[PDB]
């Protein structure tokens, strides 16, 4: 009777806190996806421009005086583009995960 009322009061405090924390967690995931969106868009621009650069370096190398350096530059750009591609893949995974969870809750 009296201890039941106390148990219900404690359950209510636990529930209200849990609800606030779950909500705050969702908002944090949203802010993380929003950031990833911005960074991803900036990255796509860089990737496209640099891919064009690396491709030109490669295509031009055989007919340049500094052939060896053009080849090396193209190769180092290709390595960096692979790293940039992995960064963008992880950014899309963050955005993707948030859209899915956003659907489930809905």
For the chain, the domains span: 1-106
- 63, burial (CB in 10 Å: exposed 0-12, middle 13-18, buried 19+): exposed
Which of 58, 85, 86 has its CA nearest to residue 71?
58
CATH code of domain 1-106 = 1.10.287.1700
CA 53 – CA 44 distance, rounded (Å): 14
Tokens linked to 71: 């080849």
Which of 55, 58, 37 has its CA nearest to residue 47?
55
What's the reported resolution, in angstroms, to a tenth? 2.0
CA atoms within 13 A on the CB side of 42: 6
CB within 8 Å of 29: residues ≥ 6 apart: 98, 101
CA 74 – CA 3 distance, rounded (Å): 75
Which of 39, 17, 49 has its CA nearest to residue 94?
39
């Amino acid at each position: 009777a009296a201890s039941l009322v106390g148990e219900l009061q404690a359950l209510d405090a636990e529930y209200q806190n849990l609800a606030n924390q779950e909500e705050a967690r969702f908002n944090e995931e949203r802010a993380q996806a929003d950031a990833a969106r911005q960074a991803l868009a900036q990255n796509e621009q860089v990737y496209n421009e640099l891919s064009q650069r690396a491709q030109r370096l490669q295509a031009e190398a055989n007919t340049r005086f500094y052939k060896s350096q053009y080849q090396e530059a193209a190769s180092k750009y290709e390595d960096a583009l692979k790293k940039l591609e992995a960064e963008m893949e992880q950014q899309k995974a963050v955005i993707s995960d948030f859209e899915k969870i956003q659907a489930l809750r809905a």
